[PDB]
Write an enzyme that holds these catalytic residues in place. Structure first.
Site, PDB file in Angstrom:
ATOM      1  N   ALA A  61       0.803  -1.213   0.000  1.00  0.00           N
ATOM      2  CA  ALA A  61       0.000   0.000   0.000  1.00  0.00           C
ATOM      3  C   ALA A  61       0.841   1.270   0.000  1.00  0.00           C
ATOM      4  O   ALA A  61       0.334   2.328  -0.388  1.00  0.00           O
ATOM      5  CB  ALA A  61      -0.928   0.005   1.218  1.00  0.00           C
ATOM      6  N   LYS A  89       3.268   1.944   2.908  1.00  0.00           N
ATOM      7  CA  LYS A  89       3.588   2.323   4.284  1.00  0.00           C
ATOM      8  C   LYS A  89       5.041   2.764   4.417  1.00  0.00           C
ATOM      9  O   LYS A  89       5.330   3.834   4.967  1.00  0.00           O
ATOM     10  CB  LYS A  89       3.322   1.144   5.232  1.00  0.00           C
ATOM     11  CG  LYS A  89       1.860   0.718   5.375  1.00  0.00           C
ATOM     12  CD  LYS A  89       1.648  -0.378   6.430  1.00  0.00           C
ATOM     13  CE  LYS A  89       2.398  -1.661   6.101  1.00  0.00           C
ATOM     14  NZ  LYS A  89       1.851  -2.345   4.893  1.00  0.00           N
ATOM     15  N   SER A 107       2.068  -5.922   9.881  1.00  0.00           N
ATOM     16  CA  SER A 107       1.115  -6.829  10.498  1.00  0.00           C
ATOM     17  C   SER A 107      -0.251  -6.574   9.887  1.00  0.00           C
ATOM     18  O   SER A 107      -0.642  -5.410   9.726  1.00  0.00           O
ATOM     19  CB  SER A 107       0.999  -6.646  12.009  1.00  0.00           C
ATOM     20  OG  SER A 107      -0.078  -7.445  12.497  1.00  0.00           O
TER      21      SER A 107
END
Ligand SMILES: [Cl-]
Ligand SMILES: [Cl-]
Lengths: 146, 146
Positions: free
Chosen positions: B15, B17, B85
């Protein structure tokens, strides 16, 4: 504090390290500084209480405490470490990792491994806690840390 | 900064991050702030690379990262966390531990568990990295963190 620093307490068991660590925190807080105490047994109980006492577990714990002090000291915090260990190896590793490092050896007359050349040596159970605290703070001033 | 805070990046793999985390660090340092990035894999590789991937080891690593963020944020540091996570549980624990906590969800249309109500939601790859950084900073300002 433009630069933080680590106060690393060392000495044989019973020398008064824990008492001094907490008294230093109380005084430096009262003075308006950002301060953290890294008590080895507290950190262990809080973060990995069931890790055991194998060598690998002992060095992981040491690396965690030292990294915590490194990051806190580089960002303007006074970091007081009271990490139970008789060995010089952890303390030499800590000094290599933490640029601004002040070792406080409480001397009492595995076997305890004495430091070579600590920033401050104090004789155990001779002066009041207040005097021990004032002695640490004066040394930090002499070193330019405070 | 009288009060630090944690920017907690979350979102599915790919995505963006990591890219946002390092761009945020670079921008906030250039603005004169105390900033640390806690990259989960870097911290694991440095502090305990041989700990394994068991449930106990994963939770220990989570607690270590969160405790680092907690201590840095309470001492005036902007702490940017990028901990891989898919699970909400670690993020909810982090929010309970870290008083000043800003969750940044990069949404992309073992399965990823969406947060309930993150402080900021960014659509993956919709804006430039520079605009993502600016949007994070504006949100922090709106929240009174900056
Ligand atoms: Cl002073
Ligand atoms: Cl700004």
């Amino acid at each position: 504090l433009e630069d933080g620093f680590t106060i690393w307490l060392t000495g044989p068991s019973g020398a008064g390290k824990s008492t001094l660590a907490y008294a230093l925190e109380k005084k430096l807080l009262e003075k308006g500084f950002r301060v953290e105490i890294l008590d080895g047994d507290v950190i262990r109980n809080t973060l990995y209480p069931n890790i055991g006492f194998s060598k690998e577990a002992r060095e992981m714990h040491n690396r965690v405490v030292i990294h915590l002090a490194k990051l806190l000291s580089k960002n303007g915090v006074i970091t007081i470490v009271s990490l139970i260990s008789p060995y010089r190896a952890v303390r030499e590793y800590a000094r290599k990792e933490i640029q601004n490092f002040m070792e406080v050896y409480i001397h009492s007359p595995g076997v305890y491994e004495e430091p070579e050349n600590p920033e401050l040596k104090i004789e155990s159970h001779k002066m009041s806690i207040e005097e021990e605290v004032d002695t640490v703070i004066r040394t930090a001033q002499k070193l330019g840390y405070l």
